[PDB]
């Protein structure tokens, strides 16, 4: 409750040091060994909201993944062996544009770049508008499928990012999917990047260890 | 008579906000000029004049969900309209570039004056003036 | 002159309230709330009955009782907790 | 039940709807009725 809130010399050399090496041992082996097939059942069984996912998607609800728990394997594998391949086979081979938020050395107009070359045909956000207003005659075919993993990402954290990703979703032709782990993530976005966002969401908790995330920030300064 | 009893000067349901964006303020305002340690006196079972000081968004919380008509919890609504009163210029932040609300070193205070606020609590029939 | 009785018809509805004063009573700066506050609804019961001349303690006396009771423990509260107080006796 | 349960966490569309009788309840319901009817 909230009155709980209201009712509320030791240091770390006193603990055994631990290298980084030794750190990554024990963390690797009960990562790999410790709830292993029943965290795998549950994924398997989470493995079946893929036809709802496409339909979503096509439909052209954004999806955003939430929970405890790494999401990145999760939205990978979704990705490239469900979504991908069955747009193609039905529309008629779409690429696949992934997104690193967990490496803060990423900048955004390296990621305006690919996008204008696989969608313009040869100030950000000038060039959005004239992207939005070309696919408006185009047809409503999936062209281009977006994963962004992190968008809680410390780059990503930012405002103008923020506002170049939801400027993306108003062309119906790019598909979004988004991921988050902080819990105060609902604060990032107002009414206006809501509207432009049109994320459904999904709660995909996971408890999925963080492996790759860990590799950019030194658990030795702790 | 009616033109120079008036300046006419002036630009021109002040502030049209949704009833969580109405709770969300007051409790904002009672967080940036209540002292800390009056918290769990006032609001636990167990100043008009001077700048606002900062506060924490778990003191914020807090207080709306004390003050807030069984409990209403922290849903993605609550959020959203709480972003809305910063893009409106509502709250004001610690911080003027590469705005990242998510940095634990941000901290919040109130933008809105008393005349303002007084009208918002007129309008919840929530009675602040007993709380000071 | 008058004497009235009790009967245990509406045992209930002041076993209760009781119950009541004394949760709310538990974590709150507030009236000693004992078995002597009790008796206090018995007692004004049997004054409200007194006025009717009734021989009897009749519900509507009870009520009156209770609700005289209630309303000056309620307002005695702080501010806080009082507009909570306010809706969470409002079955009396 | 297990299956329901994650179901109506994840907010699946495959979760049924209890606005309709449950199959359960409703074949009970026919059985009993039926069992005294002949």
Same mark, same amino acid.
């Given at each position: 409750?909230?009155?709980?809130y209201?009712?509320?010399?030791?240091?770390?050399?006193?603990?055994?040091d631990?290298?980084?090496?030794?750190f990554?041992?024990?963390?690797?082996?009960?990562?790999?060994?410790?709830? =292993?097939?029943?965290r795998?059942?549950?994924? /398997?069984?989470?493995?079946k909201?893929?036809?709802?996912?496409?339909?979503?998607?096509?439909?052209?609800?954004?999806?955003?993944?939430?929970?405890?728990?790494?999401?990145? +394997?999760?939205?990978?594998?979704?990705?490239?062996?469900?979504?991908?391949? =069955?747009?193609?086979?039905?529309?008629?081979?779409?690429?696949?544009?992934?997104?690193?938020?967990? +490496?803060?050395?990423?900048?955004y107009? *390296?990621?305006?770049?690919?996008?204008?070359?696989?969608?313009?045909?040869?100030?950000?956000?000038?060039?959005?508008?004239?992207?939005?207003?070309?696919?408006?005659?185009?047809?409503?075919?999936?062209?281009?499928?977006?994963?962004?993993?992190?968008? *809680?990402?410390?780059?990503?954290?930012?405002?103008?990012?923020?506002?170049?990703?939801?400027?993306?979703?108003?062309?119906?032709?790019?598909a979004?999917?988004?991921?988050? *782990?902080?819990?105060?993530?609902?604060?990032?976005?107002? +009414?206006?990047?809501?509207?432009?966002?049109?994320?459904?969401?999904?709660?995909?908790?996971?408890?999925?260890?963080?492996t790759? /995330?860990?590799?950019?920030?030194?658990?030795? =300064?702790? | 008579?009616?033109?120079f009893?008036?300046?006419?000067? #002036?630009?021109?349901?002040?502030?049209?906000l949704?009833?969580?964006?109405?709770?969300?303020?007051?409790?904002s305002?009672?967080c940036?000029?209540?002292?800390?340690?009056?918290?769990?006196?006032?609001?636990?079972?167990?100043?008009?004049?001077?700048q606002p000081?900062?506060?924490?968004?778990?003191? %914020?919380?807090?207080?709306?969900?004390?003050?807030?008509?069984?409990?209403?919890?922290?849903?993605?609504?609550?959020?959203?309209?709480?972003?809305?009163?910063?893009? %409106?210029?509502?709250?004001?932040?610690?911080?003027?570039?590469?705005?990242?609300?998510?940095?634990?070193?941000?901290?919040?205070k109130? #933008?809105?004056?008393?005349?303002?606020?007084?009208?918002?609590?007129?309008?919840?029939?929530?009675?602040?003036?007993?709380?000071? | 002159?008058?004497? @009235?009785?009790?009967?245990?018809?509406?045992?209930?509805?002041?076993?209760?309230?009781?119950?009541?004063?004394?949760?709310?009573?538990i974590?709150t700066?507030?009236? @000693?709330?004992?078995?002597?506050?009790?008796?206090?609804?018995?007692?004004i019961?049997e004054?409200?009955?007194?006025?009717?001349?009734?021989?009897?303690?009749?519900?509507?006396?009870?009520?009156?009782?209770?609700?005289?009771?209630?309303?000056?423990?309620?307002?005695?509260?702080?501010?806080?907790?009082?507009?909570?107080?306010?809706?969470?006796?409002?079955?009396y | 039940?297990?299956?329901?349960?994650?179901?109506?966490?994840?907010?699946?569309?495959?979760?049924?709807?209890?606005?309709?009788?449950?199959?359960?309840?409703?074949?009970?319901?026919?059985?009993?009725?039926?069992?005294?009817?002949?």
């Amino acid at each position: 409750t909230f009155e709980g809130y209201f009712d509320q010399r030791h240091t770390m050399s006193m603990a055994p040091d631990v290298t980084r090496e030794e750190f990554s041992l024990v963390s690797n082996f009960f990562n790999e060994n410790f709830q =292993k097939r029943p965290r795998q059942k549950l994924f /398997e069984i989470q493995k079946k909201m893929f036809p709802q996912y496409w339909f979503e998607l096509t439909q052209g609800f954004s999806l955003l993944f939430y929970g405890v728990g790494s999401k990145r +394997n999760f939205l990978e594998e979704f990705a490239i062996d469900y979504l991908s391949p =069955k747009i193609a086979y039905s529309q008629l081979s779409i690429p696949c544009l992934i997104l690193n938020g967990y +490496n803060p050395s990423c900048n955004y107009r *390296d990621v305006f770049k690919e996008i204008t070359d696989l969608l313009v045909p040869a100030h950000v956000i000038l060039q959005i508008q004239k992207m939005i207003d070309f696919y408006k005659n185009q047809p409503l075919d999936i062209k281009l499928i977006l994963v962004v993993h992190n968008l *809680d990402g410390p780059s990503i954290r930012k405002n103008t990012f923020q506002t170049m990703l939801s400027f993306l979703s108003v062309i119906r032709q790019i598909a979004i999917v988004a991921s988050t *782990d902080h819990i105060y993530a609902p604060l990032l976005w107002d +009414n206006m990047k809501a509207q432009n966002y049109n994320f459904v969401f999904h709660d995909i908790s996971n408890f999925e260890p963080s492996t790759v /995330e860990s590799t950019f920030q030194d658990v030795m =300064k702790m | 008579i009616k033109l120079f009893l008036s300046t006419d000067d #002036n630009l021109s349901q002040t502030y049209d906000l949704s009833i969580i964006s109405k709770y969300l303020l007051i409790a904002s305002y009672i967080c940036s000029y209540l002292e800390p340690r009056y918290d769990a006196s006032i609001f636990s079972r167990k100043p008009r004049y001077l700048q606002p000081s900062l506060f924490a968004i778990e003191r %914020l919380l807090a207080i709306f969900q004390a003050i807030f008509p069984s409990l209403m919890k922290a849903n993605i609504e609550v959020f959203q309209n709480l972003s809305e009163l910063h893009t %409106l210029k509502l709250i004001a932040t610690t911080m003027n570039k590469n705005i990242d609300y998510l940095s634990p070193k941000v901290r919040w205070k109130v #933008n809105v004056p008393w005349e303002i606020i007084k009208e918002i609590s007129e309008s919840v029939h929530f009675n602040i003036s007993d709380y000071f | 002159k008058i004497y @009235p009785k009790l009967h245990q018809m509406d045992m209930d509805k002041v076993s209760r309230v009781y119950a009541d004063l004394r949760r709310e009573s538990i974590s709150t700066g507030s009236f @000693p709330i004992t078995v002597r506050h009790l008796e206090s609804i018995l007692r004004i019961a049997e004054s409200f009955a007194k006025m009717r001349l009734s021989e009897f303690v009749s519900s509507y006396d009870l009520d009156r009782a209770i609700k005289v009771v209630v309303d000056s423990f309620v307002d005695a509260q702080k501010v806080s907790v009082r507009r909570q107080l306010r809706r969470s006796f409002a079955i009396y | 039940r297990y299956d329901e349960i994650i179901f109506r966490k994840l907010g699946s569309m495959l979760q049924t709807t209890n606005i309709l009788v449950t199959d359960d309840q409703y074949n009970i319901w026919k059985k009993r009725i039926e069992m005294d009817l002949a």
